[PDB]
Nucleic acid binder design. Structure first.
Ligand SMILES: [Ca+2]
Ligand SMILES: [Ca+2]
Ligand SMILES: [Ca+2]
Length: 290
DNA sequence: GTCTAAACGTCGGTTAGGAGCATTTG
DNA sequence: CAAATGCTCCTAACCGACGTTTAGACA
C-alpha cells in the first residue's frame, strides 16, 4: 500500500489542475465552466494510477494512447481537496491548486451561473497554468488576473514526498564515457538526477540540504539536481530510497541501478568483461527497457 | 598515468495542459 | 431542458535519459 505523501510528491511532479471554459449555446450564461484534476502517464505505468485510486477511493482510469486518472465530479474533487489540504503541495503547483480550490467553491455554490461569478472564475483561470487563450481573451476583454501566491520557504514535509517526486521527475541512470585515460577503455559512474524548471530552484536547493549531498546544474530554463559521488550514493541515496520506495516501472530501474552501484563499489568497472556485464544491465534500463 | 568527480552538451518523447462534443441527470 | 458529467481527440515543452570534456587526487 502507498503513502499519502508519496501521492503528494508524485502529484507535485505529474499532476495538473485545470479550468475548462468553453462556449455552450444551450446554456444561460452562454458558457460552460468545469474544473478538472488529472494525471497523465505512459501506458506502462497504469498501476501507479490504480494504487492512487485504491488510496483515494475515487477517480476514473482510462488507457488509450496514454494512461490517465481523472477527477471531474464534485464528489471526486472533494476527495482530491480533502487530501491536498491535509497533505499540501510544496512546488509552484500549490499556487495552481489554491486558485483551483477557490474556483471549485464558486462552482459548488452555483455562483458560476451568475455572470459575476463567471467573470470571477476567469480571473482565476487567467492566473492558472498557461492562462487564457486568445479566444477567451477576446470574449472577456481586460480581465484582471487573480493574485498568484509565490510559493517560498517550502520545507520537506516527509521523506515519502521525495520518493514520490523522484518517481515522477527523477532519474536513475549510469554514465559511460569514452575516456582513453582509463585502462578498460571507458569510464563508469552511477548518477542520480532530478529535473525541474528554475521556478522551483529554491526547492531544489533545500532538497540538497535534506539529502545532504548533490550538486545544482543549470542547462543551456530547466534545472537539474545531480549526484555522482559514490560515497553519497552508497550510504545516503540508496538506503533512503530503500526505506522510501519508488513506485512504477522506475522501481525496476532503481533495482538495476543499485545492482550496478555495487559492481562499481567492488571495482568491477575496471575489468573489461565486468564492464560488458555492467553495460548489459544498462540497455535493459530506462529507454532500453521493453 | 590511473581514475574520480563534476562541468558541459544534446536528443526526443512522456508528460503536463487543453478544448469540446456526447450522454446522463433531476 | 439545463446543468453536471462522461467521454473523446488535440498540442508541445519541461522533462528523463543519454552522451563528451575538463579540473583534479591519487601517484
Ligand atoms: Ca513536472
Ligand atoms: Ca515521469
Ligand atoms: Ca515529469
Amino acid at each position: 500500500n502507498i503513502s499519502p505523501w508519496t501521492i503528494t510528491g508524485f502529484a507535485d511532479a505529474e499532476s495538473s489542475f485545470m479550468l475548462t471554459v468553453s462556449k455552450d449555446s444551450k446554456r444561460n450564461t452562454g458558457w460552460s465552466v468545469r474544473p478538472r484534476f488529472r494525471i497523465g502517464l505512459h501506458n506502462k505505468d497504469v498501476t501507479i494510477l490504480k494504487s492512487i485510486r485504491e488510496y483515494l477511493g475515487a477517480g476514473i482510469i482510462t488507457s488509450d494512447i496514454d494512461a490517465r486518472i481523472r477527477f471531474e465530479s464534485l464528489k471526486e474533487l472533494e476527495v482530491v481537496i480533502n487530501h491536498f489540504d491535509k497533505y499540501p503541495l510544496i512546488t509552484q503547483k500549490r499556487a495552481d491548486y489554491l486558485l483551483f480550490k477557490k474556483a471549485f467553491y464558486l462552482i459548488k455554490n452555483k455562483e458560476h451561473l451568475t455572470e459575476e461569478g463567471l467573470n470571477q472564475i476567469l480571473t482565476l483561470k487567467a492566473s492558472l497554468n498557461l492562462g487564457l487563450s486568445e479566444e477567451l481573451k477576446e470574449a472577456f476583454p481586460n480581465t484582471i488576473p487573480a493574485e498568484r501566491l509565490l510559493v517560498t520557504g517550502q520545507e520537506i514535509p516527509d521523506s515519502n514526498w521525495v520518493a514520490g517526486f523522484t518517481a515522477g521527475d527523477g532519474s536513475f541512470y549510469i554514465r559511460i564515457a569514452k575516456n582513453s585515460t582509463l585502462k578498460t577503455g571507458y569510464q563508469v559512474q552511477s548518477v542520480f538526477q532530478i529535473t525541474q524548471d528554475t521556478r522551483d530552484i529554491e526547492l531544489m536547493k533545500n532538497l540538497i540540504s535534506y539529502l545532504n549531498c548533490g550538486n545544482i546544474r543549470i542547462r543551456k530554463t530547466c534545472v537539474d539536481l545531480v549526484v555522482t559521488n559514490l560515497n553519497d550514493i552508497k550510504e545516503k541515496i540508496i538506503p533512503f530510497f530503500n526505506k522510501n520506495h519508488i513506485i512504477g516501472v522506475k522501481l525496476q530501474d532503481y533495482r538495476d541501478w543499485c545492482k550496478v552501484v555495487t559492481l562499481i563499489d567492488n571495482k568491477e568497472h575496471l575489468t573489461s568483461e565486468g564492464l560488458e556485464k555492467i553495460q548489459k544491465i544498462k540497455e535493459g534500463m530506462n529507454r532500453g527497457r521493453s
